[PDB]
Write a protein that binds this ligand. Structure first.
Ligand SMILES: OC[C@@H](O)[C@@H]1NC[C@H](O)[C@H]1O
Ligand SMILES: [Mg+2]
Length: 581
């Protein structure tokens, strides 16, 4: 028997640290934009081991871990530093619901950092998966028994010693300490829900729902496994009202009417239900639920300046930098309420945008931005240094998968390919590649071309400066809108709510909360009165929460304290948005 699972005191307590279930944490459906009623959540207490990197499966698993929290986190019950010379081993038993008899069974991982190998009942389930930010799945039907099944997963993660996408993760001793700067605790292992679902053999794996409200229609591509010879019926509805339906070919775009569309905006994030049914004749072979928000994003020349236009109209995108870090969970928010809290706070403070910083969150995060009405800018997580040929192939493969996994999100409107030159290469080529791969989103070739040795490819849709404290003097070009991809960074150490007392740093330390509030609102007023009329179209305020010793959140790292006067910040942001309109 392994050492029984043991909770670990968290470095800071969030409102939800003590709210995490033991046996079924993160219970919510993990893929809310492609749904079926039948599923089973495999989160909870697994047996666990740490071996050397090249070890095979251990004969004994001596410990237990709480999936899906990384080994570095307190919530995992392990809370240990994991190096490139280590490998994580997970094992649990599971039963298949008997009502799934006669269906295929898919085993789904939302994410696992970095290189994951999976065995079901001793048999490798499929190819090793490399990449810490993209979901992956195996068809495990043929490997199952009617009895107790065993699932074993190995996960190797070299963090920054590897050539792979890592973002802010660095190999760090886990106990709070000073002097880590803007890089934080690493995240190794399974960090998003693991689950099972039954499917017909021929089944939908992906929906690409592309709003075309100007043409009162939804562009749909139904994709999947074994269905390429079929038609598909796609229906758009709201409540009990059918809005439109069409039958078209699987794997090729076709349109479904959406007459008199109600548009998705941050102010009114209206969502329509969507159902997709691959058909043989009139026989439904599979059926998935989904949704869409009817919105477009593009560039246009407005009042003499290139501007990003939402549904054909310019609105200023006033956002925060959001790094997705948790003191208790590291990469994984302790509960769904915790995950969405950070986005709710954006809304409370009058922001209409979020830049998710060199991290891709789970699908439920995109669902929350979709529902709450925030524009999303998505960074591709960077590599730690210049890639060699294999590293480039791998990074591009990851990015392709991340793009393909988010095509239907209304919130997502912009891709940030690279950040401040980190691991930079092929700046112009990657901008064109991403735009061609997802032309209904904006593309940012490089964030912070004004600084840091970052090379501007010269293309993509935006010229993106990082200016601290800011807001600087970025102006659009004839071809590109001007954005402030980072600014602000105002620090304040809140006693009782410091990850490491006295450890905090920022781009400008404030002596008290009155100073922080005045200085913050002065930045937003500057943008409203001077920079936006001169061509600035978006700004990203660093940052939504403190992270480790970077104490420039609007919120403390534990989410316990809102440092700013919410009514004042909301009023400044709303004034900016209103003025832009
Ligand atoms: O750590 C957050 C922010 O202050 C950092 N500014 C420079 C980098 O682009 C960002 O990571
Ligand atoms: Mg990692």
């Amino acid at each position: 028997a392994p050492r029984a699972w043991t909770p670990k005191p968290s470095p800071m307590t969030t409102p939800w640290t003590d709210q995490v279930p033991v046996d079924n944490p993160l219970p919510e459906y993990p893929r809310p934009q492609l749904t079926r009623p039948d599923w089973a959540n495999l989160n909870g207490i697994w047996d666990f081991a740490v071996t050397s990197a090249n070890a095979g499966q251990p004969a004994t698993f001596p410990e237990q871990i709480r999936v899906p929290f990384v080994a570095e986190s307190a919530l995992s019950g392990i809370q240990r530093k994991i190096t490139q010379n280590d490998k994580l081993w997970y094992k649990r038993t599971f039963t298949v619901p008997s009502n799934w008899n006669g269906r295929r069974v898919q085993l789904n991982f939302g994410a696992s950092d970095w290189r994951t190998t999976v065995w079901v009942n001793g048999r490798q389930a499929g190819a090793v998966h490399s990449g810490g930010y993209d979901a992956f799945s195996y068809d495990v039907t043929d490997l199952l028994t009617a009895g107790t099944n065993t699932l074993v997963v190995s996960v190797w993660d070299p963090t920054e010693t590897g050539t792979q996408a890592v973002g802010k993760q660095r190999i760090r001793d886990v106990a709070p300490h000073p002097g880590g700067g803007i890089l934080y605790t690493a995240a190794s292992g399974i960090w998003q829900t693991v689950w099972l679902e039954p499917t017909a053999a021929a089944h939908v794996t992906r929906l690409d729902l592309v709003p075309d409200p100007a043409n009162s229609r939804l562009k749909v591509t139904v994709r999947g496994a074994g269905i390429s010879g079929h038609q598909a019926r796609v229906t758009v509805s709201t409540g009990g009202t059918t809005v439109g339906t069409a039958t078209g070919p699987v794997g090729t775009e076709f349109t479904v009417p959406v007459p008199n569309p109600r548009l998705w905006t941050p102010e009114d994030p209206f969502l329509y239900d969507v159902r997709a049914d691959p058909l043989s004749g009139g026989t439904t072979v599979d059926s998935v639920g989904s949704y869409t928000g009817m919105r477009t994003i593009a560039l246009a020349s407005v009042g003499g300046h290139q501007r990003p236009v939402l549904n054909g109209k310019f609105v200023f995108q006033t956002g925060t930098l959001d790094q997705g870090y948790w003191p208790d969970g590291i990469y994984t928010a302790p509960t769904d309420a915790a995950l969405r809290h950070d986005l709710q706070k954006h809304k409370d403070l009058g922001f209409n945008m979020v830049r998710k910083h060199i991290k891709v969150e789970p699908q439920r995060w995109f669902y929350w931005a979709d529902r709450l009405g925030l524009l999303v800018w998505q960074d591709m997580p960077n590599m730690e240094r210049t890639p060699d040929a294999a590293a480039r192939t791998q990074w591009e493969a990851e990015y392709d998968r991340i793009i393909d996994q988010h095509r239907s999100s209304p919130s997502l409107v912009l891709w940030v390919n690279q950040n401040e030159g980190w691991g930079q290469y092929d700046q112009a080529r990657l901008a064109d590649k991403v735009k061609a791969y997802d032309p209904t989103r904006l593309v940012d070739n490089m964030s912070g071309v004004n600084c840091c040795g970052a090379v501007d490819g010269g293309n993509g849709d935006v010229v993106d400066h990082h200016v601290y404290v800011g807001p600087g003097t970025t102006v659009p070009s004839a071809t590109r809108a001007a954005v402030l991809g980072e600014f602000g960074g105002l620090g304040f150490k809140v006693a009782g709510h410091e990850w490491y007392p006295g450890g905090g740093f920022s781009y400008e330390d404030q002596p008290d909360l009155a100073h922080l509030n005045n200085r913050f609102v002065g930045l937003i007023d500057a943008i409203r009165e001077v920079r936006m009329p001169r061509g600035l179209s978006a700004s990203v305020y660093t940052e939504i929460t403190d992270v480790e010793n970077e104490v420039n959140g609007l919120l403390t790292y534990d989410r316990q304290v809102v440092k700013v006067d919410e009514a004042r910040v909301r009023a400044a942001n709303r004034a900016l948005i209103d003025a832009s309109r």
